[PDB]
């Protein structure tokens, strides 16, 4: 589980005293001292040691054998982000048969991330990829054929071959965005090499062509349908769908990661929504080489 | 393009589609045959067709990232300030060609002209062409202030910005004509100019040749004037923008590209491609800010 509010045998009254004391994340609780938590939250010592137990337990730490672990890695295939940190957070990388969302303020690293993945995807399972192609649906004109270049170089790959494996299409508005997605089903069947679908800023045009709280219902109706569509595609055709949303509540997306800007080059990525992923934030950086770990 | 051009479709339904509010193909391409059948009062079987034929009509082609990059070094455009509007115009106002912006008073034509008479000076990295502009002012619309604000928002030098904009009042058609004539010198004297802006080209003609009595000659003259500005843009590799103020059988027009602007909820505005060879039809929305021309929300 995630979030404190979901802590077992816990009163909803202390849940405040915990968030009023600055204890928002479970991983922060998991390692706190019962004593200091008792004093800082103004809660009975006996209960501190409990929410800390419940919190640590919520992390799901499992000491597997080196063999058993090796077994599970061949059992599954993911695209690596380029940052072991971020990968770890994501239990390996971007999964197929599923849609992952990356949301956050402008410049949090969501774009770079999209590009980065539109390249690693082409790499072989040994180096972090899936020997496949990518479809980059460009919603707001963010694609930097330059950024794909640097990323490419640093990998010792062939710039032009890299660019040749990235299907590109600008989506000028919702109607076109919807259509483009609709014709996707053919593409994937026409070229089963495709493994990565990237729709940067999916919600974007909708908030634009359906502004205000007056359209809220239709905006969601239309968007949810657009998303339920991309999800299926990913599932049926065994590929990974990635979408980024740019924010500053009844979501469809499977996995949701939030990105935040940190001291200059650095950035933080946290698992918000996810069924199989354990909560926690990790730190990575935006380099020229691409998406790497900090320091 | 356009609905009346839909294959195997009766001209009878073409009306129930325009009377139901389905003007553009892109609106059809994503509608529900079901709802379309109720809204237009058309056989369910015909709806799913109009939509099939409509979706096909959008011309969706999944090009390779490489071929696209090739097309970018091949051409250079001026950015409108709204990534929306630029998307609609496949990058921006193109050179070697004339683009018209027409619409009711306040649709954003003016703002747009000013915004372009500044973005033109920006370097290719920021969306410009590191060039100057000629602003032929037909009805006294230039706002030395509006250039200022737009200028600031770009962290540019007010003074310098204004020094890279050639300005000239064109009091009547005859002067408008002369002015354009002498343009050939200017562009040759100063090859840095890259944006010609004639706001309200048709204006003086409609005034000096009013009524349905002169319409023929009014257009004979105006079209000759436009063919003129077009050539200039082509020959001297620059961009000519003209704006026309209209209020709201395939009619003949000279202008390469034509976009219609409409007012929307207060701040917002809609821009749609009407005439265009290489531009795919569809309307997008943008807004009028103090900063200048930007996207909405």
Author numbering:
A (entry chain A): 11 to 258, 277 to 323
B (entry chain B): 12 to 259, 275 to 323
Text from the published report:
Homologous recombination is a ubiquitous mechanism for maintaining genome integrity and also for generating genetic diversity in sexual reproductive organisms. This reaction is catalyzed by RecA family proteins, including bacterial RecA, archaeal RadA, and eukaryal Rad51 and Dmc1. The current model holds that, in the presence of ATP, the recombinases coat a primary single-stranded DNA (ssDNA) to form a nucleoprotein right-handed helical filament, and initiate a search for a secondary homologous stretches of double-stranded DNA (dsNDA). By contrast, archaeal RadA is a better model for eukaryotic recombinases.
Here we report additional three new crystal structures of left-handed helical filaments. First, the basic structural element of these three new helical filaments is a RadA dimer. The other protomers were then assigned as 2ZUB_B, 2ZUC_B and 2ZUD_B, respectively. A unique property of these left-handed helical filaments, as compared to other known structures of RecA family proteins, is that their DNA binding motifs (i.e., L1, L2 and NTD) are all located at the outermost surface of helical filaments. Moreover, the NTDs are separated a long way from L1 and L2 motifs. We found that the locations of the L1 and L2 motifs in the four left-handed helical filaments are relatively conserved, but in contrast, the NTD locations are quite different. The first hinge region, located between the NTD and the PM, is referred to here as “subunit rotational motif 1 (SRM1)”. Subsequent structural and biochemical analysis revealed that SRM1, a hinge region between the NTD and the PM, is not only responsible for structural flexibility of the NTD but also is important for RadA's function in promoting D-loop formation.
